[model samples]
Target chain A: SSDRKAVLITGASRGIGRATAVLAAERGWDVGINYARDAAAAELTAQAVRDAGGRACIVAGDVANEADVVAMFDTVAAAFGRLDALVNNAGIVAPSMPLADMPVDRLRRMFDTNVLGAYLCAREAARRLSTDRGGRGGAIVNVSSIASRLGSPNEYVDYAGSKGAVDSLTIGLAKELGPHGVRVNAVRPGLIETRLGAQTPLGRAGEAQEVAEAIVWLLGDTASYTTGALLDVGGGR
Target chain B: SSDRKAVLITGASRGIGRATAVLAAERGWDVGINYARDAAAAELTAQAVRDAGGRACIVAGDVANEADVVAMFDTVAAAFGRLDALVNNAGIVAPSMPLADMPVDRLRRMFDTNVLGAYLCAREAARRLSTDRGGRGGAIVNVSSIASRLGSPNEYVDYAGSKGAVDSLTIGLAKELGPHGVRVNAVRPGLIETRLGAQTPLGRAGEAQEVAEAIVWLLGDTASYTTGALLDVGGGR
Candidate 1:
């Protein structure tokens, strides 16, 4: 039981997060599905995780809320006893608007959910998984949007800004935690089909499973030497 | 005067800035050499720009300050009568330190010069060069470091973080301004031999002139379709 690996993915109720939860479970990791509001959806994911021959637990919390994030981790920890990886995937985007037309609240919400949420989650994961912290090391894979590079502009510059912060966290944390046996990396998904993947240079959107495969690889020992890397799942976009 | 296009490169006193100024001049662009505190170095760069058979003007300002940035852009516009391109090249890095040991001031300074400064300059350039703003279209080339992706943890995460913000700005602004006829791009130079090229995957660091060539290429018509691109010049490192 102590040798069993586990992973917690935020925003796992649907889309790429859901797909990752299922796939990670199939790969033998005990899956903790952290969702914001969709309990039924998360439960289905948890059931799928169990059906994949891995343990499953549904943890409900908004990643952007500090207390919620703390409780989510506690639930995951209580169920699995240890955490081997964290996928910071919870994020949002507002309706399209120019910078001059965007409201201050929109910007604050974007940063709160995307940037601050990620920082808080990463901070907790590092504390528990760092070799310097008397715990087994782990991996952290942030789900950053291709918009970070494309600047989503009129559609969602705020979202791009948030993912950009995630990319930075991936790099800085990778270096900060490398010696301590924890690896930090990011997966930048191009336009995909699951509610967020239509923008692309590949002429077609990608499937959520395609991005999931990359995420699971980063979490496994195969990517042991690959840290601080932003693996693009964009189809040549 | 319209036949003579101008480019303003921050931190033009030495290093990559100096190289870009000299090369842009060689390529027939009137060069606006911007330096923070080194008048002598800037004068030398201005002399080189002129010797290259292109018009040269020295603009001095700290890019981190809004007033200074405004004055610098105005001076370039006044001297050259038209602006065709801008290279946001001014940046800095503190002595390497862990995030746990880093001070809040260090983080603020890094983001101020590298991220906010870039935003301010880009905004000003957009206002003057955007077709929607009653001006001709132009190009913006951001000089980003590979550290933005590498995360330079344990050493200069703050610097890496600042560059990370720059990467996001590149993406969001590219999309935001593309319709207005301004193409935004970035060059992520790996270990270059100037003062920071020793650490790299390739056996040796890159030459500043090599990077300048890439920057100028991105600024030209050849990259007409290449907006929101982050070109890496790390010699396979």
Candidate 2:
């Protein structure tokens, strides 16, 4: 039992999130997958988790909606009985636009889903994993993008802004829970080929597995005292 | 004439913001001080700017208010007719409390003033400083606290979270407007005696002037490729 840990990742059906699930599973940690849609895709993700020699529990829901967020966590809690880590990896992007031209609706949705949902999920994770409470302390590895520093001008400023919030969240939340037994950190990935990658100093797009390797390493005990960090995995992009 | 650059610093009446104004003045950059209140204090800051051999304009408004933010910028434009850089430093903090115990009112106010206000001001600064908009490209240096990384647990989690958002903004906005001739960055100050300081790895608190030097440097051409960086001035704290 001491060798087994359980992790939940938002938007785990594809991309970096899915790769993170598989990697966590490889480490002998059970993985809870929360995907927005595509049950088959999620099941495939779970299959990877299972193949990796870890349990897979799919919690289908949206992190953007309060109710759905609650449902997502509750499902994970019911199955795992305990959550040792969280991968705050779910996020969205919209078509490129000038900073002034981005619509209010798009702005609101981007902020609400990306930043708001992260807060909610982190709050929930704190409740379940903080040593201040009865549960053991854990780590929260938030998925941030290098675009946060790039501003994705004319491409995805909104997305970049949302990630800016996430990086700060990583900093603020890390110290908040560090003493309480929870570690908070973020990974600012460079261009990965999944949907957004390349155009980096490295001259090549990063694979999902590369990012997963970083996330899992952060979740592991080897990263002790590494809280509040924004690890850059970009291929120099 | 080329030595005369104008900078708008929110919350410039005191602390690090004020110090930054003085330093900017010393460097021959005009100072535009925007304060939430205390016209008298603003005047004092203006006087310091004047003493340092730069022009000063006092704008009375709250960064959190939409109209006030607009008025703040317009007053500056009217004063200098040209905006070169901005120090997005206005922010608020509340009494310490556990994360779960923080009130909704507190949360809303903190996020609105700290994060939302930053975005609005940065947007406005972008309009005036970016070469793409018929204005000279300049740098925007944001003020962030080490508390952003510490999370101020049981004290000011909201404040830390607000800073977290600002840091991300620095990254996202930096790359977005960089090509437009605007450079964006942030200063993450360690505990300064103004309100929060000490208990840092540095074994002592930092002075506002120390942070000011970093800000002035970032705003200068010496830091040309230094966009999107968070310079820590915590005396290693």
Candidate 3:
């Protein structure tokens, strides 16, 4: 069991996170599920992980909280002995508003959970995956939105800004950590039918399961040389 | 002079913008030069534009300010009576730092100038270039950094986010504006010899001239079928 490869995914309770976790599990990799608050959702995700014939450990906690993030990895390290991948899929959106109507508090909340949360989890994962420190190198895939580029004009520009930060994290970390055998990549979903993209330019949204397939691709050996890359998944919307 | 074609460039006072403006002039396009400050520097750039044998007009303004941005376009429209190309090039950056210490103000400023600024200018350019408006739709070349996918964790992460936004803008706007006969694209410059890539893994930076050449390529007939695309120019950085 200790020698089995493992993957840790934030926001694994539902949506693209859950979909990716299940797909990874299907590929026979152990899964560490990091959920923000929904124990039931995490349980279902864990069940899906098991259904795929992979060991599932639901680690419920706020990804935005540093202590929880550290503990999540500690659990993975203790149980699996090594982590092969991390999916920074957790994100948040404040009450959407134009810039003039945007409140400082809302802005803080968005960054706190969206950008900061992804960054912290990535750092912690990197620390644990250092090949020099008795750890094995792995991969990280950040789920960024198309909004990060569209800028959302009159809608959630701040949310776009948050994902923008995640974009930077994906590229910079890919270059920095590549030498350590760790690959960092990002997935910028186009207007998909997910709940998140309901009102986006695409009349429909992206499916979580469809997006998961992409995540699984990035996590696999096929993408070994694909670091600091972003796969756009909007239905051309 | 009135028979000459025209080009517009933001941040034309220095670097890639200056190089692009000069090259466009050499290619025989009348030039519209946009600069935030440094009047002498802008004059030199305009001179370079003229040295290329094209007529030149210097427009001073910030890319982020709608009124100022509009003024630049209006000047171009009035002079050339039509726009053949627009180079969305103005961008800014802050010191690199971990997200834990990332400040809010700087992030906001970076997005305003990089993300929204590109859109605002593209919107105006699209409106003015649409064939329906009685002229051939023009080409738009957005100047993006290799940082969009590379996440600049230790340096100018915020700047990288802005670049990511440009990537999205390039893809989405290309789709939206393509039908209008307006071709929109972006150039992601890798490590050359420019200030932007000075700290990249390439050890050296990219030359503004290289980026200019790529942008010119994207705007020309050779890329007739290319839209919603990004040309990487980091020399593999």
Candidate 4:
């Protein structure tokens, strides 16, 4: 096993995941780029990780599928032989609709992928991070949305609801895993250069790198007392 | 329909629910005591509400069952003729166990009761409080735990996780329901005269009344600018 820390980031092909992967690598951590599809994009992210002076491997899987979720974690273990941290970043959003008009399937799928998948990945991370299980104690940073705070009403309450579940999961896991030397936290990012970004107090959407910097800090040992906390990179929005 | 406001409090047989009901009644709000079982205790709480000079109704149902959850809200609507608020307080905790030793069923049950039940109740509350749905805008307060921040690692992480979910759900519902007239918040309590006390900064356990006071405040108009907020009743624990 390598001495460098290894981090598996779900949905690392693009967006926040890709940015976090590159940043984690730049900080001297081996990177596992996990993405549902877009193998090409995943490859690009892997190269970026390597360019930043870290070992990078592309692990393809969907966060929504238990089999794939478990397999991705296993692959990271096989390649890195050690897992220190996990970034539960894979998520989705649906078209705008009121809760009354939102279909049950969309709601179910949102919970399935966002809520259930996060648990699956976090549970797997717990297994490897549990010291009693002959594993290293580490940290987990879940990528939540400010939507949990804003409610994104009439836009995608389901997405907001799922993120709320993630934020809560971070709190629970931080305490549950605390004894085993694991730390859990989350980042609630506001608009990040999306079509809708200027509504925030900062008056502009955030760049992906800004959010990634926060993630990398939480993953490192510098943030000692920050377990089970939520950091807002919404630029004060 | 009566002009007086109404609040349905789950797990109101005793403890914090009982405290909140009595106080809310004193404040001129009709009270609906929702309990999973323990009819005797529920009755006592109902009597307290009546003694406090407000209408009291006993509502029997389980938060885990969607059908029952819907029916409970229906019952409150039928009796009060108007619903103003809901307290997602019905939850359970198991004996101390590490997450690894925790059974699959126990985990499922915790998530089912704590997470699933909370979302169900919040969804129903949203139905009544959403202005576009031809209902009055109101408030929803979820009872979270300080264990969410503490992580209760050697104890019940499941319980902590459930509370964390409640906290996040408050955030989600607050935003999703913001467009309407509803306001959502949560109160995180710590070491409230349980077998373990004095762990808080206040150096003592909190009274249920103290917790209830915060809940009642959130339900009232005085907390107009407060939504998606969490109030700690743990005496800085």
For candidate 3, the TM-score is 0.62
**Poorest 10 consecutive residues by lDDT, candidate 2 chain A:** A194-203
True contacts kept of each: 0.53, 0.49, 0.30, 0.32
lDDT over C-alpha atoms for residue A132 of model 3: 51
* lDDT for each residue of candidate 4 in B111-219, tens digit (9 for 90 to 100): 6677667777888888877897778889999998887666676677667766766776677667778888889999999877523666557878899999999999999
Worst 10 residues of 3 chain B by lDDT: B98-107
Each candidate's interface RMSD: 3.2, 2.7, 6.0, 3.1
lDDT of 3 by residue, A177-200 (tens): 777778888898876544645555
Residue A178, candidate 2: how far off, in angstroms? 4.6
* Candidate 4: regions farther than 4 A off: A1-4, A22-29, A37-69, A97-112, A148-185, A199-203, A220-230, B1-4, B37-44, B47-57, B98-104, B168-179, B201-203, B220-229
Report lDDT (CA) for all predictions: 0.82, 0.82, 0.77, 0.83
Clashes (N, CA, C under 3 Å) per candidate: 8, 11, 23, 4
TM-score of each: 0.68, 0.77, 0.62, 0.81
Model 3 per-residue lDDT tens digits across residues B1-237: 466678899988888888998887776688898988778989999888777788888999888777897799999888777788899998774776653355556655676677667766776786677676555888999988877876666676657766776776676667666677888889998765545455556656778898899988888778999987889988667
Query: How do the residues B1-237 of candidate 1 rate in per-residue lDDT, one tens digit apiece?
Result: 357689988888898999999998888799889888889999999999999988888988877676897899899888988888899998775887665555546655665577666766776777777888777898999988787877777787666756676788787888788899999999998877653444455667888999999999998888899998889888876
Candidates, DockQ: 0.29, 0.34, 0.16, 0.28
DockQ leader: 2
Q: List candidate 3 segments past 4 Å from native.
A: A1-141, A145-168, A174-237, B96-101, B133-135, B149-153, B194-206, B221-223
Would you list the rank order by TM-score, best first?
Answer: 4, 2, 1, 3
Residues B1-237, model 2: lDDT tens digits: 445989999999999989999999998899899998678988999999999999999998877666787788888889988789999998775888766565556766776677667877887887777787888899999998776666677777767767777777787778778789888899999878672344566678888999999999999999998998888888775
